[model samples]
Target: SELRKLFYSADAVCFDVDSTVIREEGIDELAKICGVEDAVSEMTRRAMGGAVPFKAALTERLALIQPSREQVQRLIAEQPPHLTPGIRELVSRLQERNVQVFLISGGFRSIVEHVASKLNIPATNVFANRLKFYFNGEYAGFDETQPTAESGGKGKVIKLLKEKFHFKKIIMIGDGATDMEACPPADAFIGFGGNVIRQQVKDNAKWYITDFVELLGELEE
Candidate 1:
């Protein structure tokens, strides 16, 4: 019973991609490669503002950008500016505690996989949109089966994972409207704004953390 209660208490940590895990907007960067920076920027705003679904924004933006495969590869290799201040430490601490960490994002898998690898996080626990590329190296599009590409994407992932692992406790952390909208699906929703914390997102989170160190408080026994 104790295990079950706490399993519902503290056993899983799900992180959002993009501004949450890293400091850069992966999709925006892809847009840049496609020469649609301005358009992607607007989509970013709309997606984060709850004006559009993350999948719609991601798919539409990707369609417009159609960045070459080489461009995507280059971006992954470049390691878009990450929030290095406390990320490594935070992730290390969580793993040390035996917490299950999962990276769930609406961003492209091309970028998420790179970050996950660099962080020593397994690719199996990573979930996000997959960017298909043509033989010519141009963006083909995203896999429609991805939950993030559908309504309540993050929530769907959380629910699916819960059914499979049956974690008694779960936490979702991010800095966007979609993250906020998925709050009810999580036992605890941590709002991470170190990169960019939208007011709406902050208001919806159960725990508001501006710095990764704030997580220490939550880890307190």
Candidate 2:
């Protein structure tokens, strides 16, 4: 109870893209559109369960989907990421207090950028894996240089964000081990489970919440 101000006094808040900010995981949705839903989703489960490295899961999933630029474009057009309940208001409240908001995602930059636009977060504040395409817009491969492309990536990005911006108290919000690990550098970790609850996160998080209302209500006036 003494540390509740962690949320009320956050200098920066970083959100993990998939189940935290939106209702569906981006790659699985993309795979569903491409008729490879089970394949990608199984990879997602394996990665989440700690059975596979994130990069391996990501690479295998993308290899199976092989989404062309046009397919990606169409997917984003036809199915914009569905913002989780109360997130827009939460972001707005944070912005009103001048707290920097960032989207650190393992998903593709294009989709992450779309969600960032909706949240009104700047492109420069977003970090995610980049998807690549050939000159003909055929499916090529993903950019391998992104930090968020591999496991433990979120912590690295969060550390850089803290160093780059000098944020005294960075708060991380998400639904996985990656989010849980960011707290040493992040000052605090808030587990979110409005979509799907993970027991690992729930057990470790000192401040786990199933909805953003629990968070929105805690904002400082």
Candidate 3:
């Protein structure tokens, strides 16, 4: 009965994009488009460490330049390659347990969408920033209204999903300060560091895992 309860009680999982799902910074790539790579990277590091608000950081970074649509497209195509070991298996196990997966990201929708598709997550469940491009193929700006770009974005998305799906429990996995911010709203927060480890994120996460196999222990328990 205890095991059944544990398995059935868990209902949803949310994931952070960029360093969490992949080993790269989406904004850093976007910055290359604007020719403000150095500036954006600095803002990103600050935001990732909780030194600055993610929303403000992103807005200020995006304001640096108007990137071309072609540039954004190219960046998306070259998005960071590779997923953490056993991530696919972890998702599969979650699905086997009837858990719905949501990909919430402050990263560009272009890359987020691609990752979602690869993981078989529905487009509707993926929340991310939309990059707008000009007719001349330059990046005009982003859709700030998107929940992923706002303060407490992940919390907002979690609230919406909880109301919509009536999920009894939710877990978030990520590798940045923004990911850590979701802790208040999620039942569990798992920090991943197959690539680089951020101390702030590690400190905030409920559990630190370098590989997905470690989650099996949690699930089995």
Name model 2 segments beyond 4 Å from true: 1-4, 218-221
Per-prediction TM-score to the true structure, in the order listed: 0.89, 0.95, 0.85
RMSD, every candidate, angstroms: 3.7, 1.6, 3.3
On lDDT, the leading prediction is 2
lDDT of each: 0.77, 0.88, 0.75
- lDDT by residue for model 2 (5-36), tens: 67878889999999999999999989987889
- Residue 103 shift from truth in candidate 3, angstroms: 0.6
For model 1, how does the per-residue alpha-carbon lDDT over 101-150 read when each residue is reduced to its tens digit?
A: 89998887878888888677899889988878888876677799988788
Model 2 pairs in collision: none
Residue 12 error, candidate 1, Å: 0.5
Estimate candidate 3's alpha-carbon lDDT, on a 0 to 1 scale: 0.75
- For this target, which candidate reaches the highest TM-score against the unseen true structure? 2
